[PDB]
Swiss-Prot record, chains A, B:
This is Growth factor receptor-bound protein 10. It is found in: Cytoplasm. The GRB10 locus is imprinted. During embryonic development, the expression in the brain and spinal cord is from the paternal allele, while in placental villous trophoblasts and skeletal muscle, it is from the maternal one. Expression is biallelic in most other tissues. Paternal expression in the brain is maintained throughout adulthood. Imprinting often is isoform-specific. GRB10 is unlikely to be responsible for Silver-Russell syndrome (SRS). It comes from Homo sapiens (Human). Adapter protein which modulates coupling of a number of cell surface receptor kinases with specific signaling pathways. Binds to, and suppress signals from, activated receptors tyrosine kinases, including the insulin (INSR) and insulin-like growth factor (IGF1R) receptors. The inhibitory effect can be achieved by 2 mechanisms: interference with the signaling pathway and increased receptor degradation. Delays and reduces AKT1 phosphorylation in response to insulin stimulation. Belongs to the GRB7/10/14 family. Widely expressed in fetal and adult tissues, including fetal and postnatal liver, lung, kidney, skeletal muscle, heart, spleen, skin and brain. Residues 7-83 form the SH2 domain. The chain holds residues 487 to 591 of 594 of the full protein. The PH domain binds relatively non-specifically to several phosphoinositides, including PI(5)P, PI(4,5)P2, PI(3,4)P2 and PI(3,4,5)P3, with modest affinities.
Length: 100, 100
């Protein structure tokens, strides 16, 4: 159900993700989620803060988490909804999605 | 937007909430949410753990939080969904809601 979300970019690569975020200005809080190219059940969150791009692996366990289970979610929509309001282990909240 | 949720008991007193939890098993993780009796813009999470009833004030910040703003939510549904999967400051996760 997350496939058509504005912040979900599908099976793009890491390199493509960094290209996109840079093209869109490296604005604080700019972010996107993508499918892992190695694990068919995992995702990656790419976000930038203070001009630095960081990647966080969202792994299953079924619930998802980007902090080794310290904080769990039932699906990606719940996860994004949460990090838009709470930093957690991230450098900043998820503010604006990178345009697909 | 939480008015019609099954875990929301509206304007019932603390005493009534405790009576309800006791009468429905007094089991770990049993919970309900209700309107605050002292703050017209606040809510209360009543939860049972180790046969002890605990009350957590959910205060507006408009966002909501029961842990002094450390964890914030856009509404009660997001809050409940989060605490059903994450303990946080609660003695345990929200497991079963009390039937109105």
């Amino acid at each position: 159900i997350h496939r058509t979300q504005h912040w979900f970019h599908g099976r793009i690569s890491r390199e493509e993700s960094h290209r996109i975020i840079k093209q869109q200005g490296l604005v604080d809080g700019l972010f996107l989620l993508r499918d892992s190219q190695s694990n068919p059940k995992a995702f990656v969150l790419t976000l930038c803060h203070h001009q630095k791009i960081k990647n966080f692996q969202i792994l299953p366990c079924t619930f998802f988490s980007l902090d080794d289970g310290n904080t769990k979610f039932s699906d990606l929509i719940q996860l994004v909804d949460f990090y838009q309001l709470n930093k957690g282990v991230l450098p900043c909240k998820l503010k604006h999605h990178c345009i697909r």
